[PDB]
Design a protein around this ligand. Structure first.
Ligand SMILES: *[C@@H]1O[C@H](CO)[C@@H](O)[C@H](O)[C@H]1NC(C)=O
Ligand SMILES: O[C@@H]1[C@@H](O)[C@H](O)OC[C@H]1O
Ligand SMILES: O[C@@H]1[C@@H](O)[C@H](O)OC[C@H]1O
Ligand SMILES: O[C@@H]1[C@@H](O)[C@H](O)OC[C@H]1O
Ligand SMILES: [Cl-]
Ligand SMILES: [Cl-]
Ligand SMILES: [Cl-]
Ligand SMILES: [Cl-]
Ligand SMILES: [Cl-]
Ligand SMILES: [Cl-]
Ligand SMILES: [Cl-]
Ligand SMILES: [Cl-]
Ligand SMILES: [Cl-]
Ligand SMILES: [Cl-]
Ligand SMILES: [Cu+2]
Length: 235
């Protein structure tokens, strides 16, 4: 159980974004149904009144939390990968529009899943804003907790992979559009019961064997990291 509080741009807190520039759900419950419209932007997908201004090459940092800001973030049991997608705002997230900007599953050197590192990062993970057309966008951050992913939700609705999905409204002002956005995948639709990384046993299969669900990261993407960029406690 986890939610987004807000974002930072180039290491500068943009402030509490909940129901303001984040299309926040009312609580931190996971989405499990792969076929639900809730896969798009969680259970309350609607236009919220602000959109965060950024330029290509900026560092955009999602900040997650559990019950309160900068707490334990997400329960340590919730081992799994983290991805970030982008789509044009005009889509409202419908159709084949989501382009993957970032993937992190398991780090062999440190022996840590993305979620494990997100905790250590005080909930913060970033992407570098790509050189797409100026305009309004949705950035869809997705955490997949795998602690009950040995079962499929479609077969046993009390278990299943757990999706913590947050959409941020982001406006890209300065960009040369030198890497125009390509074709994306649909949510719901891209992940099915047979997709790699949706059904997995984290307890008996070595984490080095895990493969995260496709699509693969777009070649136009400019990187990201799971790492603290700002200290929330100073505010
Ligand atoms: C999953 O979502 C689909 C599409 O909305 C829906 O028809 C189905 O009833 C859902 N499954 C459960 C178990 O609620
Ligand atoms: O559902 C519970 C949620 O309310 C809390 O925030 O995190 C622990 C969960 O069990
Ligand atoms: O399957 C179990 C899951 O529901 C909890 O975490 C421990 C697992 O054994
Ligand atoms: O011991 C593990 C249990 O806690 C969970 O489910 C899988 C088991 O291997
Ligand atoms: Cl929890
Ligand atoms: Cl604030
Ligand atoms: Cl669900
Ligand atoms: Cl605005
Ligand atoms: Cl809070
Ligand atoms: Cl860190
Ligand atoms: Cl749970
Ligand atoms: Cl540019
Ligand atoms: Cl579907
Ligand atoms: Cl980064
Ligand atoms: Cu949880």
């Amino acid at each position: 159980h986890t939610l987004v509080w807000g974002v930072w741009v180039n290491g500068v807190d943009q402030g509490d974004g909940r129901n303001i520039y984040i299309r926040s759900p009312p609580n931190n419950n996971p989405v499990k149904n792969l076929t639900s419209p809730d896969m798009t932007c969680n259970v309350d997908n609607r236009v919220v009144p602000k959109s965060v201004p950024v330029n290509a090459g900026d560092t955009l940092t999602f900040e997650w939390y559990h019950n309160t800001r900068d707490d334990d973030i997400i329960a340590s049991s919730h081992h799994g990968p983290i991805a970030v997608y982008i789509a044009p705002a005009a889509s409202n997230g419908q159709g084949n529009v989501w382009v993957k900007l970032f993937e992190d599953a398991y780090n062999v050197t440190n022996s840590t899943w993305a979620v494990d590192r997100l905790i250590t990062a005080h909930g913060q993970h970033s992407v570098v804003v790509p050189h797409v057309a100026p305009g309004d966008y949705l950035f869809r951050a997705e955490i997949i907790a795998l602690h009950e992913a040995d079962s499929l939700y479609s077969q046993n609705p009390i278990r299943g992979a757990q999706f913590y999905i947050s959409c941020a409204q982001i406006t890209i002002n300065s960009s040369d559009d030198s890497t125009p956005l390509p074709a994306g995948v649909p949510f719901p639709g891209a992940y099915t019961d047979s997709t790699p990384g949706i059904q997995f046993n984290i307890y008996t299969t070595p984490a080095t064997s895990y493969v995260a669900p496709p699509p693969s990261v777009w070649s136009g993407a400019l990187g990201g990291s799971i790492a603290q960029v700002g200290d929330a406690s100073l505010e």
